[PDB]
Amino acid sequence: PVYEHLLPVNGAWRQDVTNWLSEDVPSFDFGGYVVGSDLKEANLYCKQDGMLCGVPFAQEVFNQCELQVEWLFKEGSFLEPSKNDSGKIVVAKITGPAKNILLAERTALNILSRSSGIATASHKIISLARSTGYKGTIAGTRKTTPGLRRLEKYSMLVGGCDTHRYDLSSMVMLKDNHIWATGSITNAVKNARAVCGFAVKIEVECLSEDEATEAIEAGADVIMLDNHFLLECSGGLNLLCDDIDIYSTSSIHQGTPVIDFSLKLAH
Amino acid sequence: PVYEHLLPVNGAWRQDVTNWLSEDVPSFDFGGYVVGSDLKEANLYCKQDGMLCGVPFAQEVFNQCELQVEWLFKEGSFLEPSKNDSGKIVVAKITGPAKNILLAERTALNILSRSSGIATASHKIISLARSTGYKGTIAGTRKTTPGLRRLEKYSMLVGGCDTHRYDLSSMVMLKDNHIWATGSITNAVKNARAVCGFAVKIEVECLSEDEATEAIEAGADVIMLDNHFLLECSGGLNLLCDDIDIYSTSSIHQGTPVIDFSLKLAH
Amino acid sequence: PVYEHLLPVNGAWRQDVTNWLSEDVPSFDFGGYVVGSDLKEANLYCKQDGMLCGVPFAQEVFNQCELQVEWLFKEGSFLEPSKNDSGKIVVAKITGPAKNILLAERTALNILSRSSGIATASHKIISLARSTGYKGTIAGTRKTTPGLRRLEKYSMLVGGCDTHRYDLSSMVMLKDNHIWATGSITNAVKNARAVCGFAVKIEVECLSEDEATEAIEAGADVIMLDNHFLLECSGGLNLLCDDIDIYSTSSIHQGTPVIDFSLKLAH
Amino acid sequence: PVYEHLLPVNGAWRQDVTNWLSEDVPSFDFGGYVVGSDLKEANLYCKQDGMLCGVPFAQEVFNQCELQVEWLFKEGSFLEPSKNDSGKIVVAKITGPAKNILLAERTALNILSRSSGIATASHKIISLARSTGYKGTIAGTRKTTPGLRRLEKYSMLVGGCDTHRYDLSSMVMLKDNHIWATGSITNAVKNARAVCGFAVKIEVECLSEDEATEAIEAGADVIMLDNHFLLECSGGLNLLCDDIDIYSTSSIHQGTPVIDFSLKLAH
Amino acid sequence: PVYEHLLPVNGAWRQDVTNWLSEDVPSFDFGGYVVGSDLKEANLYCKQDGMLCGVPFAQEVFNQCELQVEWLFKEGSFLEPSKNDSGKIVVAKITGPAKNILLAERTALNILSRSSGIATASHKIISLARSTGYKGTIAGTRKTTPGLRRLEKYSMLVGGCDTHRYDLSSMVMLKDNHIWATGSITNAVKNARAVCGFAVKIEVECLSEDEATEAIEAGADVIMLDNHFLLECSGGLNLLCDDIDIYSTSSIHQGTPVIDFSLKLAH
Amino acid sequence: PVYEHLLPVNGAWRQDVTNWLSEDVPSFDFGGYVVGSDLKEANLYCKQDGMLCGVPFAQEVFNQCELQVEWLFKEGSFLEPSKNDSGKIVVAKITGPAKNILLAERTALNILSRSSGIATASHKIISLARSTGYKGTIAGTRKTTPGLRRLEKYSMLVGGCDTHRYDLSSMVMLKDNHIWATGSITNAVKNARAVCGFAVKIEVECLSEDEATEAIEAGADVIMLDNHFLLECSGGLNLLCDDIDIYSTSSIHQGTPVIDFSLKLAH
Numbered sequence A, B, C, D, E, F: 001p002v003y004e005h006l007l008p009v010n011g012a013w014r015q016d017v018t019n020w021l022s023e024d025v026p027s028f029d030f031g032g033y034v035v036g037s038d039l040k041e042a043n044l045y046c047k048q049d050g051m052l053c054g055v056p057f058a059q060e061v062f063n064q065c066e067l068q069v070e071w072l073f074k075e076g077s078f079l080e081p082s083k084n085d086s087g088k089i090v091v092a093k094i095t096g097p098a099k100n101i102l103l104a105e106r107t108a109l110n111i112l113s114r115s116s117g118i119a120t121a122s123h124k125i126i127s128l129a130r131s132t133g134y135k136g137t138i139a140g141t142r143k144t145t146p147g148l149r150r151l152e153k154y155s156m157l158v159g160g161c162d163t164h165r166y167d168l169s170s171m172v173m174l175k176d177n178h179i180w181a182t183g184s185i186t187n188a189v190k191n192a193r194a195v196c197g198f199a200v201k202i203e204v205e206c207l208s209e210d211e212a213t214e215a216i217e218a219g220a221d222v223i224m225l226d227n228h229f230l231l232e233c234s235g236g237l238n239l240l241c242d243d244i245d246i247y248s249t250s251s252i253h254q255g256t257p258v259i260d261f262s263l264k265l266a267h
């Protein structure tokens, strides 16, 4: 199975790429005027160790900029530029009008660097959490970059982690606020179940068995314990995991370092 | 002078907020349905030391969700949640319908956490270079998060750094590419000048004082070097600061850690 | 609990209303020009028996046209315009500039008529199956009107039916296609699970208890048949209701009759 | 002449198709991930008697999903699946990546089923109204589905009826409200004529000859009688038509039943 | 009757204003940052003789920038900044935050200057033809500024001219092309009528009374000639006005001079 | 260097063209229905003396309308139709479906006529201002047509003039308002420099040397004198230029006459 097949042949994600280009060229591209449209060739280099992610998104940038791209690595490949190659590894070869290449450059790399960065941070964490014997799952959160949720969630998947619920319409998540308001957790879950129906899971954030009792009771599919159903623990920082089904943490995607890339024309 | 005044009373940045809300509620807000619309109070907490930023953007989120907000610190205030008596500082008091607070919560926090992160990274870096006699200035780059350029460049400013050119339409930045293409740094600058006009500057990435001077006479406004005019050094990070007018780095905005925030109802 | 609370205070659904107004006034509103802006009163009448629905959507239309509205019945009220003394029931009192009322009129009525239609069809069908001992539940499908999914699924809910998965991102629904492709119901479910994660369910359309069980063990959350887990029957309409957890049909929302409404000024 | 030539080679109607796809895939298409991109072949079946409509719109769905379509029937063709063929008739053959076919499926059928449904209801009515000897015209209304006016009006045309005015900017339509406000029908029409000019027709809703007098008087092009100019009668229910030029009725498009379709991959 | 009532309370024209503000502030408004938000007063001056137009559009700009405006003249007032005591007439008093006034200034002026220009050119031309016994009417064309059709056609109306058909969907206008294609003016009109229906007119560009009459009998509503029905002459400009129902010219709206305006703070 | 290379291979300017087409065809294109899709050929004529401008924009109209265009003149070419050729000169040959040609016609010409019109007015002015011995620069303003700034600024460049700052985010421009508010011009420029940074120029509108003193003082890059730095004079009307670096005037783009064009199918 190929991860890039998660993206619909057409949809709003492609218009996003268009909007990212417009963000970079509000009026005219002066540099492209001087460099002209002569056919050039360029190398796209990875300059740091990590997992390659965000290929389909970057590919869409190149398509709209009408360039031809030859990827030398599949998405998900671990790159090690430090051994040494002048510090870099070419992961793609670009061909097309000079101005088009230089126009597509910044946006494409800004995509790859962050996407690869999240996959690398994602993989590092689950790998590290799984090396302790913990066979549960490591998940993200909804603490994504505004307007970039599609790409960031996608990067979590390639990094090997669970994306968790995508948004507020995906899985009901009731925490203390919701419960106080409906009153009973069995009522909170009752109402939640009334609208979300059977096709969506309901998770409840509990403190004591009491809550996690009526919660399991009412029919909640997931119980979060904070401090025929699943258990979750939100926080995951360091050193330990203990047979809980899910440990959620924004560390795999929010505020993670980026994986540097560069693009240089042949001559 | 107030930074938020940099943002136009109306414009695309506000629709951005709207699209960020849509990103999180593609269809229904089940949690909002259970929680209902009773008036509530909530505290917005800063959970980590750093410079507060993203206030007007978080405020626009609160406005669209029809809430009332009381900010306790001006934007740019160096927060220090050190007192551990809680390790948090209430940065704002929020009031409104229960479902509205919970709907605005994630989106607003994702804004504040990242904006404050960048403001912080930008401030600790410009001061870090300030504590070495360097009296020039630190600048950003175009390596910003796709679709979030306006917010990130805004953070850099509050952070104390120079944002540098905003996009591919805000300066001309010519490299070897544009010089090889035009024939000479003078031909490239002549061309760039032919389109950008007197109102916009032109920067040339010279790699020799020999050419740098023909660039300086070609009409350039800024001269760059890297591994009647300004001078810049572009690249990496440590130790090294000659008296160059500007030093740019994506370190003040790209791949920076975020500043933890949270929101809790009074109950 | 109030259904309209399912809709976010702000989001794409409100721009939808705006685009619906544009659809009706591409350029000028001549009738509005003749009628002017004198304050007027109007009665919104229900002309046929059925469950009232589409109130928050009609209300958003009235808000954008800057009108004041007084609703006489809660959403979901079974209206019966039988008294013929008029055969109509005033469902709302509207006041505002004459041109504003007439501009909002068609759009708001088209909303109410269709939303009430679906709520009605959905209610008479779920009860129709309820009066045969069946205590499971009736669900909708993805066979919704293009661009009107949010409104139609909303109607189903008020109507008393389960809306079923919202889109191609809200459950995984695997068929022979996905099984042939992956090799086994278990391979398909393993793959679906690899991307949707723990937060979202997976339904497999088994056509044999032999496989249905490998689907049930593969990790499925729902098992479908058609001409620790739930069970569904998908298809047609009459007479027949075994104790299957769910029965889906596009009959509750697609091709349903509408519920006649009208609006008249006081004069 | 070909009906599909009414749609501009490019325009907002194509972006609508894109928006309908996004409505179905807010985030990821999990099913498409498992089924992969293997080239498949599929049959598009009509499962109910009626007129085939909405071809260009469905074709646009397939283009954006990058599929190849072979239509075995021209738009407007009467299909009779009941005789018998296993109940179905293949009207199109689809070829393309498996995931693309399955992605395009739901939206394309949701289009065809409703479009064909309106054309069939439209044709049935005029045919039935014309079999009484009435040689006038049968027209629709503005009681269309919000956001789907282009397709629904189009379906009326293929069904053989008149679409009537497209929107509030097409033809002025003054009913009692408008007249009371300008005062005289000759004034109401006077003002209306002042802005709409000569390129657009003015229709007035009358009660007594008096109104339909000054109406014809002032220069109204169409007179609606409700209960060098044209006459209209809005309501048309059943059994009779009497030499009036136009009988308008929402029965040909609003709340009509749908014509079922299905799509199944070859193997 | 008030012209501004031609514009719907809400619709795409208001988003247009918003996009016009974005066009002018792609990122930040530095000038707004220096000037701050102190309440100020300003005078909007008309600097050249002509008919005032574009008031509701300028007002929408002032609304979005959260300002209060006091208009001194009704739209359509023939302004004459002749008194030279100043050569200007205060057309409106504006109050609000300093940055808001300065942000709204250019956009609002560009609106007023062009709208007033067209209203003026349209008025001096229709009267110019009026002072030659001609009692028919002057009309516009489709040769409008891209993206500004609504504003320009609006100006024509206030200017006193007929706007003519609004777009390619508001009349059918058939030429030799459509006749050659269909075979006869009658076949073309029959086809046009088959799709536009009774509600919309059909104009045929006849170049012979011989055909003009078959067009007139084919069902045409308007007959055009150029270098139970109306008659039009399309083309140029001078001296010549037979008793033809309509004379169209792009002179009343395309390539017209603008009417100078300015805005100044009280200080 | 080619001017059309200033436009990004993809960006919002292409969506604008799409929006201009939709503005012309809100619903159906009746004329295109009758004329059908037969392959035709057409000539695009220039009917007035002037400079050809707006080629890339017009080309984009033809691409979206799927036509093939053969340009017989490069953008910037001076056309002289008066000598005589029947008054016209073919500058492009169009080939494609009849309906597509007729659909693209109006929008393409509305573009060319205005663009060529601005370039011609632009060239005429600088040429005339440069024939006096003045070797400074002639610039435009921000008094552009709302929503058409990209094309109008572009036309100024081809006409030979300077576009001046593109928008409110391009170059800071402080006039009396701004100065009064910050107080000192050295403070006004100080604050301005605080946010705009080094990459953007600051221009100050002065009255007396005093202002133009502290202005040069604080570090203002351009001084406008109204009545290592540049001088500007805004107003330029007629007869004289005196060794100032820049004379700005909206005369080169606002309210300029248009250069007529026409398109006629071969037969």
Ligand SMILES: O=C(O)c1ccccc1C(=O)O
Pocket (backbone or CB within 6 Å): A140, A141, A142, A143, A164, A165, A173, A234, A248, A249, B106
């Ligand atoms: O963002 C959060 O608060 C969050 C935190 C942990 C897991 C899941 C979520 C979620 O909301 O989906």
Ligand SMILES: O=C(O)c1ccccc1C(=O)O
Pocket (backbone or CB within 6 Å): A106, B140, B141, B142, B143, B164, B165, B173, B234, B248, B249
């Ligand atoms: O984006 C970059 O690579 C960049 C890096 C350093 C300074 C400026 C820029 C810029 O292009 O604006």
Ligand SMILES: O=C(O)c1ccccc1C(=O)O
Pocket (backbone or CB within 6 Å): C140, C141, C142, C143, C164, C165, C173, C234, C248, C249, D106
């Ligand atoms: O859309 C369908 O064909 C469908 C039919 C019945 C249940 C669910 C669905 C669904 O796909 O969500």
Ligand SMILES: O=C(O)c1ccccc1C(=O)O
Pocket (backbone or CB within 6 Å): C106, D140, D141, D142, D143, D164, D165, D173, D234, D248, D249
């Ligand atoms: O929708 C209506 O009220 C209506 C009803 C009958 C004919 C035409 C119309 C119309 O408005 O165009």
Ligand SMILES: O=C(O)c1ccccc1C(=O)O
Pocket (backbone or CB within 6 Å): E140, E141, E142, E143, E164, E165, E173, E234, E248, E249, F106
């Ligand atoms: O656009 C034109 O060429 C035109 C010219 C004169 C009248 C009407 C029109 C029109 O097409 O609407």
Ligand SMILES: O=C(O)c1ccccc1C(=O)O
Pocket (backbone or CB within 6 Å): E106, F140, F141, F142, F143, F164, F165, F173, F234, F248, F249
């Ligand atoms: O539009 C103006 O006021 C203006 C006038 C002259 C030069 C420049 C400008 C500008 O704002 O950019």
